[PDB]
Design a protein around this ligand. Structure first.
Ligand SMILES: CC(=O)N[C@@H]1[C@H](O[C@@H]2O[C@H](CO)[C@H](O)[C@H](O)[C@H]2O)[C@@H](O)[C@@H](CO)O[C@H]1O
Ligand SMILES: CC(=O)N[C@@H]1[C@H](O[C@@H]2O[C@H](CO)[C@H](O)[C@H](O)[C@H]2O)[C@@H](O)[C@@H](CO)O[C@H]1O
Ligand SMILES: CC(=O)N[C@H]1[C@H]([C@H](O)[C@H](O)CO)OC(C(=O)O)=C[C@@H]1O
Ligand SMILES: CC(=O)N[C@H]1[C@H]([C@H](O)[C@H](O)CO)OC(C(=O)O)=C[C@@H]1O
Ligand SMILES: OC[C@H]1O[C@@H](O)[C@H](O)[C@@H](O)[C@H]1O
Ligand SMILES: OC[C@H]1O[C@@H](O)[C@H](O)[C@@H](O)[C@H]1O
Ligand SMILES: [Ca+2]
Ligand SMILES: [Ca+2]
Ligand SMILES: [Cl-]
Ligand SMILES: [Cl-]
Ligand SMILES: [Cl-]
Ligand SMILES: [Cl-]
Ligand SMILES: [Cl-]
Lengths: 571, 572
């Protein structure tokens, strides 16, 4: 099955501006303040180059330099509508993207002479931070989600193709974060911002929005966006990152988001007006549904941020927002989807995924071979740098397999590194760890191979092993508290698994395999091919397991454990 | 970055008398024949009011009512020297402008009792028409340029702070103007007069002087003013108007002048002893150099004369010399410069400019909005009035955009106005036109939008479009002969551009955009975004292009063309 393939870097942060022109040409526009331009592919997304837009295409009067306007085709007229992420005007095409453009006036007319600054004074200016215009109701209505950070999302609505506009009666909201353990402070408050909208087969609109909770929240409309239900938690985990919904030609729904859990808030997190530090923006994920959202599959990592481990992460090539959050998609053919994702010129990417890979039931890995592409291992230097960022270090390193040969394996231990401690913000990220994604399953079997390091160990040394439903940081010791299933490997007095109350001893200084076969609310744990015990599920999930998470447990520097292979198969 | 800002009217014509007192106080003295006075700002140039000078400050024994004495601070003693534009005495201060003043005697002493008429008979009297004392050679020498109208510039030199004086061996001269076409007569002869002097980094002195040629002329001294090189044309275009050079705190050189070309001389211009009529004094310009004059930028219009279009220009509130020629400068801070400029109470101004505006690389305009501030459009009623002046009319007028809406656009046509003709002096200023400044560039891109008026046209109707290196009058049909690049838009037999030998048709009844992209000795011309042709440079420039000039070409009354926007970008 074809793995995700990076094909280009878009010329703006992802989420707006990616637009199919025809069966072979796709463009990604930009937020340039100069003469407008775009990145273009003429081979259906495989190769790309920059090009200047023609003279009839309007400059970015609104928007910001790092984000393109959203550009959307009207399915009835086959023309395009363009709005900015913020500010500026509503432009409609006549003759396509390379034809004439007209700006919408306050009185519902079209202005051809928008190069005249006097004539721009009477142009319609839609308010708020906007996302993507979406045509609904057999193309007869267009709605544009917009938000205020603390006020919530509402919708700009037009019933005449964008000539005249009204605002929905209500929209989407979500509650403030409540500081309770393990948090020592409050998350940045976003009130159901950055909504994405999908029309369902029964005509309902589903709005999915970014929140300060552990998951995105959602609401529904029965009147094409004029009024919306009470909001509620969605099944898509994630916090303060963006969701995008789409639909393939065959009706399959695609959900793109950053399926992560941030680190608990620290003791200097601020009052929640703005963010203190981002600890959850280094991946992007995909899931699909063939039955109108009744069931979902996939929950696969599209990509991990290539810079995630590095001690200069926060400031390399300018401090602007960075990572793998935000996305937009264009279907390429029956199997392939093009995704623009991420923020910052060193991080944002155009990636081709294959739905057959989304639907796969197995995955395997070896830490020595696959660390850079597949393994989340970063810890943080807890000193805020750049714009709401931390620099990182790898929390674990590859070492020679003590059995000999050429294998390299991952040493997971409690680190002797004072730089990973901030006493004022009261955080200590010295426990090394590692986490790895696999296709989601409510029933599955995961096997991993590990070895106790021949070295000094602390009284509490070992490894907490968890199955989770989103990506928890490698250094997050609270993962077990949210996990679907979790148990410790304890090294002292002698090595053993603790499965409920049962202790299962095993030898140090030798490779061993542990299997977890989970189904419903129970997991059976095996050691070297022999049933060892069972685990009761610690937390229910709306989706199932899609990560295994390993973190050291020692509270003083130790030698820890080595991790070799992991494989997973789901039902 | 602010555009130039008028802040006051000085109490004398510009060029002498503007003097910084301290970090916040600046004064402009006057030529009053009564008790001396000055205009003063106590907020570093922003606001101004008149004040009487204190009792120790001498009256203007020399000079003339419309000009202040020059006042200059000695950088070593921190005291001041004062000389008149003509006549009078040499005064030195002891205790500053509001302290004691002493007059220099013929025998190199200082007279304290200059209020006594008897004692004034033995005071030193420097001859000629004098400009500004300048201290050179680490402040150890002071020199004062002086001239005779037909004899040339020389320098009064003192090596003891103004106590004793000698004259330079030579100075600056410049040739008489020659009456060759398009002239029908000779320009007023001035022999390198009104010099301004700047000390260069290497100790050379540069003198820049007003002439009867198309540009100021210059000469150089290697001995702090005793002897001067042969004279030569300078890079600063202009005729029979004043130059001023100065240097900012950071070493940047500033050149202020009137960057214009006068109309060709007419058939009754006289023998050149004195002027017949001034046709080039309605603007002032600035340029700067950070590399001791090797490279210059700016060439921007500081201001246009607000009265320039009017049919009573020559006589309003008295006929004395008027316009925007003559200037003097005082730096205000790192970015801003105060300039006194012009002549006549209704015309002379104190203006603050910003060096970041001087260094800008773009400008844009729309005729209907910007005509009064930015567009030179005047034609002349060719009847001499007042003192060497013509009354004017606007040669082009704003009309409704035919596309509809509130936009106004400028109609440029051959006028039916016999008042614009003088058959004895043989001039006919009935071709309307318009010209607009932009920052200098040896490379650049200028775009303008035009449309043919729906009306009857003559066989030669159209618009001659020129890029120039100084301001040519709106009604000057010879501009094309001096232009860096030029070409005609012709309306008959059908509308077309003529680019060399290539005819490029365009439609009537619609707006069109022409682009001119120049580099070196060629300009690429585009029409509505499509390359149309090329133009070879018609005349080289020492500086580059800083004006676009549009003039009607019809020789009988016609409907002409409309002009909407122009924009410019240089240093590509
Ligand atoms: C436009 C701008 O500079 N805004 C500043 C910052 O705004 C936002 O910060 C959040 C995180 O809190 C997020 O990264 C947004 O993308 C970003 O625009 C923010 O630093 C704020 C802090 O007081 O100041 C704003 O001016
Ligand atoms: C002092 C005076 O009245 N001078 C007369 C005039 O002199 C000068 O004229 C030139 C232009 O020719 C210029 O305008 C000077 O500023 C001005 O002083 C001039 O009219 C001259 C003509 O014969 O007679 C002078 O007496
Ligand atoms: C106009 C603006 O600020 N857009 C920003 C948006 C906004 O801050 C958030 O939606 C809360 O309002 O989020 C961020 C972000 O990476 O957090 C990137 C966008 O550029
Ligand atoms: C004493 C005197 O006449 N000074 C005049 C000066 C002089 O005529 C010229 O320098 C040729 O000598 O020029 C003029 C002028 O605007 O032309 C204004 C001065 O008041
Ligand atoms: O989760 C509750 C929601 O479930 C959806 O299937 C339905 O379309 C919504 O109207 C709402 O009932
Ligand atoms: O234009 C010629 C002049 O160039 C100057 O740089 C130099 O100082 C003068 O002495 C003279 O050579
Ligand atoms: Ca936070
Ligand atoms: Ca003359
Ligand atoms: Cl960018
Ligand atoms: Cl816009
Ligand atoms: Cl499909
Ligand atoms: Cl006066
Ligand atoms: Cl005097």
């Amino acid at each position: 099955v074809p793995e995700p393939e990076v094909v280009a870097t878009p010329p703006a942060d992802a989420g707006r501006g990616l637009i199919r022109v025809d069966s072979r040409e796709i463009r990604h526009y930009s937020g340039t303040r100069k003469e407008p331009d775009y990145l273009v592919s003429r081979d259906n997304g495989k190769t790309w180059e920059m090009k200047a837009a023609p003279a009839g295409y309007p400059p970015n009067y609104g928007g910001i330099p790092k984000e393109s306007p959203a550009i959307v085709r009207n399915p009835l007229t086959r023309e395009f509508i363009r709005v900015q992420p913020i500010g500026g005007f509503v432009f409609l095409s006549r003759g396509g993207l390379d034809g004439k453009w007209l700006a919408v006036t306050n009185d519902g007319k079209l202005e051809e002479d928008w190069k005249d600054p006097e004539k721009r004074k009477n142009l319609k200016k839609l308010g708020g931070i906007m996302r993507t215009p979406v045509f609904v109701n057999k193309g007869r209505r267009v709605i544009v989600p917009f938000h205020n950070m603390g006020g919530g999302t509402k919708f700009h609505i037009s019933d005449d193709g964008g000539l005249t506009w009204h605002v929905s009666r209500n929209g989407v909201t979500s509650p403030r974060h409540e500081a309770r353990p393990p948090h020592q402070g409050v998350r940045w408050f976003n009130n159901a911002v950055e909504a994405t909208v999908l029309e369902m087969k029964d005509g309902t609109l589903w709005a999915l929005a970014r929140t300060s909770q552990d998951q995105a929240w959602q609401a529904f409309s029965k009147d094409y966006g004029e009024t919306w239900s009470k909001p509620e938690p969605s099944r898509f985990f994630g916090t303060l990152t963006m969701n995008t919904l789409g639909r393939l030609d065959d009706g399959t729904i695609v959900s793109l988001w950053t399926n992560t859990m941030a680190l608990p808030e620290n003791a200097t997190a601020g009052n929640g007006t703005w963010e203190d530090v981002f600890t959850n923006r280094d991946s992007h994920h995909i899931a699909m549904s063939g039955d109108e959202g009744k069931t979902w599959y996939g929950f696969r990592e599209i990509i991990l941020d290539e810079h995630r481990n590095h001690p200069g992460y926060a400031t390399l090539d300018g401090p602007e927002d960075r990572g793998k959050h935000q996305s937009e998609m264009v279907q390429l053919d029956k199997n392939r989807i093009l995704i623009s994702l991420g923020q910052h010129k060193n991080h944002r990417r155009l990636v081709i995924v294959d739905r057959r890979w989304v639907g796969a039931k197995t995955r395997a890995t070896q830490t020595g071979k696959d660390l850079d592409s597949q393994w989340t291992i970063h810890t943080y230097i807890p000193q805020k740098k750049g714009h709401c960022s931390y620099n990182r270090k790898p929390s674990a390193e590859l070492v020679q397999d003590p059995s000999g040969g050429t294998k390299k394996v991952l040493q997971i231990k409690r680190l002797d590194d004072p730089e990973l401690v901030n006493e004022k913000s009261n955080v200590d990220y010295r426990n090394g760890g590692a986490t790895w994604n696999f296709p989601n399953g409510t029933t599955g079997l995961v096997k991993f191979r590990f070895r106790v390091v021949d070295g000094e160990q602390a009284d509490d040394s070992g490894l907490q092993v968890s199955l989770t439903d989103r990506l928890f940081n490698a250094c997050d010791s609270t993962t077990k508290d949210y996990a679907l299933f979790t148990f410790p490997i304890r090294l002292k007095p002698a090595p053993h698994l603790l499965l409920g109350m049962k202790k299962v001893p095993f030898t140090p200084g030798a490779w061993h395999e542990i299997s977890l076969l989970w189904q419903g609310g129970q997991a059976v744990v095996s050691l070297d091919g022999k049933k060892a015990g069972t685990l009761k599920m610690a937390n229910k999930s709306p989706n199932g397991a899609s990560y295994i998470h390993f973190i050291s447990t020692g509270s003083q520097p130790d030698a820890g454990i080595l991790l070799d292979t992991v494989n997973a198969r789901v039902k």
